[PDB]
Amino acid sequence: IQMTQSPSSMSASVGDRVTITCKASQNVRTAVVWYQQKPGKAPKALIYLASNRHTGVPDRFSGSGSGTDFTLTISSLQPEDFATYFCLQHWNYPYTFGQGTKL
Amino acid sequence: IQMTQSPSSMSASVGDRVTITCKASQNVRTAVVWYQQKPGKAPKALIYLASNRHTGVPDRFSGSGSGTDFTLTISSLQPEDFATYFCLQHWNYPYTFGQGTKL
Amino acid sequence: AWELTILHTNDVHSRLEQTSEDSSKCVNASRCMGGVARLFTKVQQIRRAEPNVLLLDAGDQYQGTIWFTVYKGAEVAHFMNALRYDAMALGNHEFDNGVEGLIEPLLKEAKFPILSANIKAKGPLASQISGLYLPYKVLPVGDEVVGIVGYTSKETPFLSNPGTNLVFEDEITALQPEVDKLKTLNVNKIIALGHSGFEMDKLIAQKVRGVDVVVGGHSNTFLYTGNPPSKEVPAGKYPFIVTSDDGRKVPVVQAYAFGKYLGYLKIEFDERGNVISSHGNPILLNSSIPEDPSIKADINKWRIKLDNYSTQELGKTIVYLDGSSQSCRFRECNMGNLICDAMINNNLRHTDEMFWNHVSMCILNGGGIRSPIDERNNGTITWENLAAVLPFGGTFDLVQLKGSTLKKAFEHSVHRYGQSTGEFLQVGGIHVVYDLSRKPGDRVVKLDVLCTKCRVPSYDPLKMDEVYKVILPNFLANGGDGFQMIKDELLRHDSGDQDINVVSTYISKMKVIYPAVEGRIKFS
Amino acid sequence: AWELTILHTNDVHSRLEQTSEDSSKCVNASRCMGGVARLFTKVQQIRRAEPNVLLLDAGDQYQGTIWFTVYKGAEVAHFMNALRYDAMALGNHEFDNGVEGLIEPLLKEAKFPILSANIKAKGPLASQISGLYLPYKVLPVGDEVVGIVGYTSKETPFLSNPGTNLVFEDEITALQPEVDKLKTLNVNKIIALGHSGFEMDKLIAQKVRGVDVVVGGHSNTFLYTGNPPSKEVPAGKYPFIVTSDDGRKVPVVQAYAFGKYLGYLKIEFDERGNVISSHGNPILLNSSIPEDPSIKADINKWRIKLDNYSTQELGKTIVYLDGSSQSCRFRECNMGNLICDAMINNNLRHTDEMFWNHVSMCILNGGGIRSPIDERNNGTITWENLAAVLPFGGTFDLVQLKGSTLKKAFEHSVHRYGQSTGEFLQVGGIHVVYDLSRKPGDRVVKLDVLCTKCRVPSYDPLKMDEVYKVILPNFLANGGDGFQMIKDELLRHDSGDQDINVVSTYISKMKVIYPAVEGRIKFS
Amino acid sequence: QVQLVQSGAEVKKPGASVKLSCKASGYTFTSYWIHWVRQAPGQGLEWIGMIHPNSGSTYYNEKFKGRATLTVDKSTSTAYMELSSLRSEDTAVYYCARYYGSDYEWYFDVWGQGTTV
Amino acid sequence: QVQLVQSGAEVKKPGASVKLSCKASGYTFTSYWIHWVRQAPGQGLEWIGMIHPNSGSTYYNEKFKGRATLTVDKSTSTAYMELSSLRSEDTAVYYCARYYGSDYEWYFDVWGQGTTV
Amino acid sequence: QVQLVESGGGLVKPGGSLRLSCAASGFTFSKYAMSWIRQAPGKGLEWVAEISSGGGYINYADSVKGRFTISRDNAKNSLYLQMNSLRAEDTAVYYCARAIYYYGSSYNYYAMDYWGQGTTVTVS
Amino acid sequence: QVQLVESGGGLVKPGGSLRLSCAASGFTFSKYAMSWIRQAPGKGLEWVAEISSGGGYINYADSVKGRFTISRDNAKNSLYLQMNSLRAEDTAVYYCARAIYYYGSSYNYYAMDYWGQGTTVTVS
Amino acid sequence: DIQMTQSPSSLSASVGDRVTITCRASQDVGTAEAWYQQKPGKAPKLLIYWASTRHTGVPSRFSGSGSGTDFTLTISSLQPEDFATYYCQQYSSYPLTFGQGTKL
Amino acid sequence: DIQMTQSPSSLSASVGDRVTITCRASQDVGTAEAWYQQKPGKAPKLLIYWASTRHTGVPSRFSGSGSGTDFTLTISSLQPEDFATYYCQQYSSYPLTFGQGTKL
Ligand SMILES: [Ca+2]
Ligand SMILES: [Ca+2]
Ligand code: NA
Ligand code: NA
Ligand SMILES: [Zn+2]
Ligand SMILES: [Zn+2]
Ligand SMILES: [Zn+2]
Ligand SMILES: [Zn+2]
């Protein structure tokens, strides 16, 4: 729970590799789904179960987890990678999102 | 005993680091003395007990050992480093020299 | 209105591959039973047929077989995740290897919740184990919501090795508040799930209020209505019924043990969340139901280390272990003296500060000792050499007895001497004497036991009115070999660990054994 | 013509720091003795004074004290290299931790030779240990050459744990050929050096031919001519003299034990290499001889881990170990039952294929048990808690006895009962019974021991004419507490390991101990 | 297949009660759970509760007990929210979503449009 | 301090016996061991034996037993070798050396000149 | 029915010694751990000492570690505390609280359910 | 005074069985390990089998492993060997050698000091 | 653990309202924590242990919550007999500290 | 170990000379090795074990040497009764191999 995110203000230029970290208060066993929200629009799913990739996502998106620490790694930056990347939970009944890190 | 040497034919140019290896048949406990022989002259001692340096030798000479494998390391090559470097024993009564590696 | 079907298992005790009708080991593939792949098959058929389904487990899938000795809880998690288990409770054998052996394999890799509502942590163990087990859960089943609640036995501290910073409260008082809260959460369908026994299940259906159904285990009980399809004699009807103090009908269910059976209970609800109708019967997994290869391949590739490990050294010996028939059934035989030492070394729990240990005794019959072990193979002992001594897949059971049933047993053991009968008793923590010249039934003249209500152990006589806790095999507790007195005059019964594992852990610890004949039995 | 002086030590048994007059532990610095720094001082003085000198060791500087338990042979090598030892032989305690514990610390780091000529390797151990010990050596002393030769005891397999691929031949037959070869090498001065005993030293000076002097040990013998300066009673003159079968005079020497003394033997040779004159006397290292700081600094910095390690957990207990005085001297007391178990567990050697082990018995008197141990400190045991039970720095000694001396001992132990006297015997591997209503000297009615000439251990009676091997403390073997019969009617004596280390290794292995009172002693 | 319009722009000064909608098309309405979220400015997102067409059987997050209720119609396939006793800081964007998954892999897939309030 | 001339050039065709010398100066002769070596062409070096002034007490390497003997004079400070039954392959350079060291650190320090034969 | 009555509190000079005693009746006294808690003058509560059900395990705070001594006598159903180096900071009331029961585990890390009236101890 | 006399050698058809026996006199037979060594026709020696002082540890070569059987009877002071699948390669003499004594160690990795005359075994 | 700051110090209330009290620990108490109530100059009384359980004899309006390092005691519809001082404990470490206090 | 090549195969000698025989092992025999002598059509006899020891009853002209993987038997001043076959063993591994042989 409480689903905190590390890099609130993270900025990088197209061509490098970026990462985002999500840390939970309690033990959520690989039950995290990473979301993406373009400004002024509804979000869209990227990774479910913290390891699988949603059908239709480039291979440049990956995932990790298995515990209380979860990370999202982005490589081969393109001019479609700059938005807000949330991080929520579906393990216990009251679901907690994260604050959101902009890129 | 039998005091074999690895690099019978070893050649290098001034400025690099060179090494010579001595291997014995039996266990001679750090009782090896490295010698140097300029051509057509009597040899001269370099290292006794495989670790100590003879009074009057440059710091570029070192030593190792403690077992059946003994090595001599040379760095900061100068135009005085090219001769034959023997390797003998004084542990058991019949003393055995080595064949000799030229540089 | 709304309908759901419930599928439950319990007390699998590591019967992970297919088994016989006695659930020990099956060698004729055409008449064999159980298994996890067959269970996968049946479960998937029911799931495709019906839309609202629940698969539950009620604990104790850890001690038994040879899969637990080697892997230690990894296979449990793997094949549970494969089968799509919807929940699980905690039993008494999950704490065998300790909480540190619980947390990593099971509690962290499992993709499904594990429940208990009477388990509370004090001290430094509060930070470590918080967030890993839950008192209750909410699950969306079909187009509705179902509330679950768990509970666990209170005798676990005396039946396993949990720790000293874990507490085990009374079930009812710890259960009622969560039910009340769940009702205040606008949730009207409730299921209890736990590992406590049958009788306490019945009480939970009378004293607790708000519980629609009770799922349980830990007693190895058979419930069939109709004509039983196999050897097991039913103790009652299937959806057992009890009149609650709040004026309701509440069922109770339990599907025997090992993998021989499955449960299938259909229910009908109404708009407020009250049970209307209930009917079903357990399933029997005969060979008529085929297996699932994608599982058997995984099993077959996991079975290699089992054979690689059964040829390895455990320890050593410098004496001859006479597990023969002319010795172990006529006199004292050092193999039994080794066996009970391990039995006690396993049953070492906590120091209550008024006793050094609660149980200090052993009993074992000579019919459970088949083969000897010779020391002339570099002084080596192997799992096979042990399996050849105890070829039955039994267990060592903890019970209670008065001081008279025990004398009856020791008198029956010697009432016909000279026929190589398997009724002779090897002992541990006991000093006994015989006089075979007297009439049967009055051949025991002396009998001494080992003080527990005591800081310095010492041997004291027997009092014909006092409760003694004892260890003995399941074959004897269920009355095998003419020992009906034990099955009729016992005051409690709790199962235990596999025998071969006990002896194995004893021998891997001493690392060299020189057992001897001491004088625990003699003739005057 | 030529002169050399010889300095020898033997049987230091890890007395590495300064000691008392009893060589146990000294607390008043102004009356203390021994040490390695004081020895350094004296040695260096003699070396500057005289040009031809030899420092030798004759084995056994491994078992004893608390330096060996912690470091395991590193300190030996370090401080031997510091003192400039010229040679060394092998004893019976160099094989305590096994050959793998010998080869690395001592044989590979030592800068001086280690000798033995009756030790031969068979099998895979031939490749590993070849080139690391020698049968003989040649040394240039002064302006001449001196030949050395070594030898070692034949009972090492029964006095330590060498292995099964090491052989121990007869000394004389293995010694003569090397002397002959040395003579063919144009070497005429010969010294023998070894750890076998006094008597065998004498025989080597008569049967072997070509040996000018014999240095030895392993018997802890004092040789002084004149008036002894301290408690030790001399058994003979200093350069002991024996008439060789080849018509010569050959000396023999030995400087007691621990570090209390040093040897100093001056010799005069001629042109062919024959002993002319020999005179000397051992030295006593009283406080009049000061110490050497560059050593004491090294010692003080090495002593930290000793204190850090004496506060640590070894094992655990769940019972009360009654090492009191009203129990351990009047009845059976479970502390002794623990102590003898460790004693035997230490004396486990090789299976001759006709016996499971050569020794199966223990004896211990109640005067060696001072304090109890209480379990109410988390169930913890510490080196200090043990040192408070056995505060004497003793040893457990292996001997042989007939079957009558033993009965004499067991009758003397109980001839005045009721005075808290330290003559009561705790036992192991023995079943005994008493009847205190009879006249003294005839109070023992039953006595049973444990079969060794046997594959299955079993308790059998005693035969008043047979040799039994037994374990008992040094205080008893030397006749302490009125046990003169043992010192008068024994048939051999070999020292052993430190008691506290024995118990320590027993407890660190079981890792949990629940000893009990069983009935090894009773009254009718 | 496509979650469609929720509503336009409603002011509803403090005190009144609002009633949103979430209409869906392109699939069988009475087969999936429907969830409501809210992203008030200045913080993260918030879960509200579950509504399932076919009898509803809702479930809220123990922070909006009497302050919100969930309704369903389906006949014309519409989900209804209702905010009562509106407070000042309730300005935020209200969303609609569907729950999709088979065994353990669940996630929101058809995210609805925004309805600022 | 300086090991000095051994000899010049001796042919000694097969059959005869040679007698070399090793003269030393600059230190006390009767205090150190003296060693002899031989480097025949085509192989490494060879140890021969020990000679100590002050009574000699020699020691050979069990390969030259009767084929060589060591002598000392000192009065004029000279060491003498002697090769008997000279063989064909005995062509090599004969050296002289001194043994120097205190406790465990020994080494040849004053190496003599060469005497080809 | 549980009652705990304390007694033995008065006035002492800096450096004196006093012995407080706790009676007990209404339950089985040989099953429960007990503690001593003191409340300063118009301030918060603080924990002092404790003792197991049989006097075997006695543990102390940092302040009174070296001046106090807790003990119990199950035969007479009473508790005792002994204070030796009374300083000026030991001025407060003193409570005699019982401890929760744990079936099969240890007695440590408990909470107190039944307290007592209290006594006043002044050291000036 | 040690003598070892062998007997039991003749002619056999490929596949037959024969039993050789070694007598012994002049020492204590219950202390020494013994071995069987066979010398091919005009060729070198080769090792066949062995047995400890009490018949407990019996070890075999690779060839005869599965066709031979060594045993001893200390009471009569004799040794026996049993050959079952006699092939054409078992044509050679057969020696009955004693083994060195090791005081306190095992009996393995020994050398043979006292041999015997030998017997001829032909399989054609 | 050691600190146990009981954040609120004095709340003004009247019969009928809903009052909430917090007790923030320091490192991590887990779930072992209790709530006490002491009247003016009387012996304290235990209400809730294990951070959610209610001692036998407490009114139902008392309820605990929270886990980790943030707890809370809530009373709904205050009553005349409920104006005392409330203390929060912790038994995860072993100085067994209490809370400063809160007057209602 | 396994191989035990006895290098020499046939040496020509006469009473008085000095003969030397070598036995080169394969990996490392250490120092466990023995030397046997078999007359024409008679049982062998042991001379030297442990690679340097001499069995009781052997003439002094027989002497062994060598260690590691290179051994040697030497007879000085051959005698009329010393024309037989000599074999070299090894007991460091456990096929207990022998040497091919050498006729003198
Ligand atoms: Ca209901
Ligand atoms: Ca001599
Ligand atoms: Na039951
Ligand atoms: Na002796
Ligand atoms: Zn069970
Ligand atoms: Zn159970
Ligand atoms: Zn000694
Ligand atoms: Zn000794």
Tab-separated table of N, CA and C and ligand atoms in Angstrom, chain D residues 196-200 217-219 493, ligand 4:
chain	number	residue	atom	x	y	z
D	196	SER	N	59.335	-41.090	20.913
D	196	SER	CA	58.967	-42.487	21.111
D	196	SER	C	58.924	-42.862	22.588
D	197	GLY	N	59.805	-42.268	23.381
D	197	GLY	CA	59.873	-42.567	24.797
D	197	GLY	C	61.304	-42.664	25.294
D	198	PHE	N	61.480	-43.089	26.541
D	198	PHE	CA	62.810	-43.204	27.117
D	198	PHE	C	63.414	-44.576	26.828
D	199	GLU	N	62.647	-45.634	27.107
D	199	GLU	CA	63.157	-46.988	26.966
D	199	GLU	C	63.576	-47.274	25.530
D	200	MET	N	62.733	-46.883	24.566
D	200	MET	CA	63.073	-47.139	23.182
D	200	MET	C	64.302	-46.323	22.792
D	217	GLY	N	61.919	-37.790	23.835
D	217	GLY	CA	60.866	-37.248	24.661
D	217	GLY	C	59.705	-38.211	24.766
D	218	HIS	N	58.528	-37.642	24.973
D	218	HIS	CA	57.220	-38.287	24.998
D	218	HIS	C	56.922	-38.969	26.328
D	219	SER	N	57.878	-39.025	27.251
D	219	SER	CA	57.686	-39.686	28.531
D	219	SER	C	57.653	-38.727	29.708
D	493	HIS	N	50.636	-46.317	30.013
D	493	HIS	CA	50.066	-45.011	30.281
D	493	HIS	C	50.405	-44.129	29.099
K	4	NA	NA	58.199	-45.077	28.181
